[PDB]
Each structure stands twice: as C-alpha cells, then as structure tokens.
Design a binder for these strands. Structure first.
Ligand SMILES: Nc1ncnc2c1ncn2[C@H]1C[C@H](O)[C@@H](COP(=O)(O)OP(=O)(O)OP(=O)(O)O)O1
Ligand SMILES: [Ca+2]
Ligand SMILES: [Mg+2]
Length: 430
DNA sequence: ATTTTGACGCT
DNA sequence: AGCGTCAA
C-alpha cells in the first residue's frame, strides 16, 4: 500500500532512429528517398549482406541478414547502397559520424546514454519539472503531441490509423489532472511533449526521422519505442503495464531475447511477461540468480532502477574482419598484411578520437578465430597501447597471437585464421 | 559464407 | 584478465 514503491520516480525516453543506415544513404542520395532500398556490405558473395532496410522494402519481406541476391527475388526493384570499403574492409565511418550528429542534438535537451549507434536513453525527470513550472497549471493540448500514441488507448464504449491515435490521445488528455505537479502520468505527458520537441529538432537539423518511447524506466521506454515505429512515439504509463504485459512474449523485453529468456520460459512454463508476477522474488532468484531474480520480480510489475548513464561517447573503438571459407588467412604475410590494414583503420579512428574527445586509449585487445573452432573467438589477449602507430599496433598484435600458429613451417599459419579483431580500450583523459 | 560492431556480466 | 551473453 503506502510503502509499495511503484517505480514512477523518473521520466525516461529512448530515441531510436528509423532504418538508420538507410536514412543516412537517402539523405546523401535523393534518388533513394521514398523507395524500397537497403544498405549492403560487400557484393561478390550473393550480392552482399543486407544490414538495413527501408520500410517500403520491408513491405516486400526484405530483412536484415538476407543476401541481396535473395532480397532481389522478393523485391526486383530494390535499390541498394553499399557500405564504403577502405583498406580491404567495410568502413562504418559515415554512420558513426551521422550518429554523432544526432547524439549532439539530443544532448542539448538532457543527459544522454548512448546505447547504440542510433539509440540513446534520455533522463527527462529534471526537464519535466522545469517545464511543469513554466506551464503554470495550464492543460496540455493534443496539438503539442502530434505523433504520440498512448499505449492501451482508446478503450471502452474511425477505422483509420491516425483516427485511432487521436482517439486514444484525447481519452488520455481528458483524464489527466494537470494541477498536480507530482502526478506520474502528468510527468510522462510533459516528457512526451519534450520528446516531440527533441524529435522535431533531430529531423529539422539532420533530415533523419526517429521513433521514441516515453516511460518511467529504460526497459519500458525501449519496449514503448518499438510499439509504433516508424516516425512515431509511444507513452507507456505505469497503469498500462498489466494489460501490455499480459500478452507480451518474454523475449520482447530487453535482455530476455536470448538464453536467459528461453530458460525463464522453459523452467517456469510461462510465455508472457505478465505471468512472472505469480512468482515470489526468492523463487525467481532461485532459478535465475540474485541479480536477475530481483530484476525480473520488479520488471514484470513495470519497475526498473537501472540509471540513464551519462555517457555520450563509445567506451571502445574496434575494427574487425571475418575471413570465411577459402579466404581464411593461411600465410604469415597474409596475417601481417591484414593486421596492418585493421591497425591503420584503428589508428585513423583513434587519432580523430583523441583530437575530438581529449582522451587516449591505453590497452589494445587482439582477438582471433581459428578455422575449426566452434567459438566465435579462439583467443583474446590484451597488451599495452602506448603509441597511436599502426605499424607498432600490428606488430604487437602479431606478437600476442603468433604462438597460436601450430604449423612447423615458418611460412604457413595453421589452423587458418577466420577472423581478426583489434580493439582499443581503457581510455584516460589527455 | 551475414558482418561489423559495442556494453556489460561472470569468475 | 579472458570468456560469454545480448544487443545494434
Ligand atoms: N546485425 C547487424 N549487423 C550490422 N549492422 C547492424 C546490425 N543490426 C543493425 N545494424 C546497423 C544498421 C542499422 O541501420 C543500425 C540500427 O540498427 P537497428 O536499430 O536495429 O535497425 P534500423 O535502424 O535499421 O531499423 P529500425 O527502424 O527498425 O530501428 O545499426
Ligand atoms: Ca533504429
Ligand atoms: Mg537501435
């Protein structure tokens, strides 16, 4: 009752760019705008691998991970933009730079946590308090929420999409108590007004559209964001949680899409997030561990305490390349040449990072996979990163991996290498 | 023979 | 530290 926390103490948003790499390429090439199109890496093998897909192309069934040759069978007029290749490998610089554009705009509104190249969480609690003080008891107009859905509404006693959206928003706003500055639902609504402003700023200043979720924590904001993509935002209130979770597959909640989620389903014999409420905290801890158990117990009730971390920049800078099938590296010269290519890209990125962000990486992580090994990585070894020099970094990486070569023959590398990975970590201020 | 990333937990 | 999980 009066002491049961309800996890309604914060306003958190998650902003997620729509079909991000496609929008970057469509901004650059107007011929691709409003067309079925996809972004591909490499071209020789089956037309290249698709990594991003416009919503027009998704209507034909095109998805990520599909080979372009196969996507063309579903959508013969599919347009393609290719990821840049530099030093023999795919180079994602254009997308990293576009990400910086968006992250810098979002940072004007609030502290952000960069969650991925095209996603950031926003802690809006303080901004909401300020805006509520500005509003001075004035009701919130639907005109301030032109792209907002209220999850769960309309309900109770138009057949078009926008009509339904407006009916739900009207029901929500009609029922708000706009005089109580401590009302969580009012706080979320003001949050959504701010997020409309943030999303408009992003689109105005970059050309990119995005979706967003607004709720009381990161997990619900992320779930909310996906409910009405693209180019829309969704408010998930605390009161919406029981109905929303009652038919929500466990795997849809962030962190439960893999083995742990599968084990929750198998061990407990349930399918939906809401079914978790029937277990005690101790029962959940007994199956899934102390941390996961407490997290699940609160999460299934819509409660999560994970903070929005103040971090706008990536914590690592890495460069990776696979060498599948016959392209596996089987000679010392090959291994050294590719370590150099990776190290040259890494040096360029690190030097730019040091100039932009006043920091220096101090550890180099080298990871490889050997042909035959079932594991993704066969070996992961660190060494000191003391100079931003590609030849030094590639030599040090070779030094730390050379003992993996079983071959008695100096010229040959065995088993052949199917992946190389260099990653700069452990940044210090400079 | 999706690939190229990136954060965070475990021991 | 090196390995594993989960997510863009
Ligand atoms: N598995 C992957 N491998 C490589 N790049 C990826 C992968 N998944 C996503 N990306 C890249 C390309 C995407 O445009 C970008 C953001 O990913 P993501 O948010 O999952 O999808 P998306 O932005 O393309 O579409 P959506 O509108 O559904 O968010 O990251
Ligand atoms: Ca996205
Ligand atoms: Mg994303």
């Amino acid at each position: 009752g009066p002491h049961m926390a309800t996890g309604q103490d914060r306003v958190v948003a998650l902003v997620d760019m729509d079909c991000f790499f496609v929008q970057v390429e469509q901004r650059q090439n107007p011929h691709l705008r409003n067309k079925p199109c996809a972004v591909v890496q490499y071209k020789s093998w089956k037309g290249g691998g698709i990594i991003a897909v416009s919503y027009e192309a998704r209507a034909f069934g095109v998805t990520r991970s599909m080979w372009a040759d196969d996507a063309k069978k579903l959508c013969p007029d599919l347009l393609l933009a290719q990821v840049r290749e530099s030093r023999g490998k795919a180079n994602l610089t254009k997308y990293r730079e576009a990400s910086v554009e968006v992250m810098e705009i979002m940072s004007r509104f609030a502290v952000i946590e960069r969650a991925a190249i095209d996603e950031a969480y926003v802690d809006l609690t303080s901004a909401v308090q300020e805006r509520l003080q500005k509003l001075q008891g004035q009701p919130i107009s639907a005109d301030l929420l032109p792209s907002t859905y209220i999850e769960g509404l309309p309900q109770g006693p138009t057949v078009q999409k926008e009509g339904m959206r407006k009916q739900g928003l009207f029901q929500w706003l009609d029922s708000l108590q706009i005089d109580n500055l401590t009302s969580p639902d009012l706080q979320l609504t003001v949050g959504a007004v701010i997020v409309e402003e943030m999303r408009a700023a992003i689109e105005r200043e970059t050309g990119f559209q995005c979706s967003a979720g607004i709720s009381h924590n990161k997990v619900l904001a992320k779930l909310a964001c996906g409910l009405n993509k693209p180019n829309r935002q969704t408010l998930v209130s605390h009161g919406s949680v029981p109905q929303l979770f009652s038919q929500m597959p466990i795997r849809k909640i962030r962190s439960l899409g893999g083995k742990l989620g599968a084990s929750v389903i198998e061990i407990l014999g349930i399918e939906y997030m809401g079914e978790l409420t029937q277990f005690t905290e101790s029962q959940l801890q007994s199956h899934f561990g102390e941390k996961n158990g407490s997290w699940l117990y609160a999460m299934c009730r819509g409660i999560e305490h994970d903070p929005v971390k103040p971090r706008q920049l990536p914590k690592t800078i890495g460069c990776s390349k696979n060498f599948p099938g016959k392209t596996a590296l089987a000679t010392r010269e090959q291994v050294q040449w590719w370590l150099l290519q990776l190290a040259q890209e890494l040096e360029e990125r690190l030097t730019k990072d040091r100039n932009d962000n006043d920091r220096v990486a101090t550890q180099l992580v080298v990871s490889i996979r050997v042909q035959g090994d079932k594991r993704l990585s066969s070996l992961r070894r660190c060494c000191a990163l003391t100079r931003y020099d590609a030849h030094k970094m590639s030599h040090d990486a070779f030094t730390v991996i050379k003992n993996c070569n079983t071959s008695g023959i100096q010229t040959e590398w065995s088993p052949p290498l199917t992946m190389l990975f260099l990653c700069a970590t452990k940044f210090s201020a400079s």
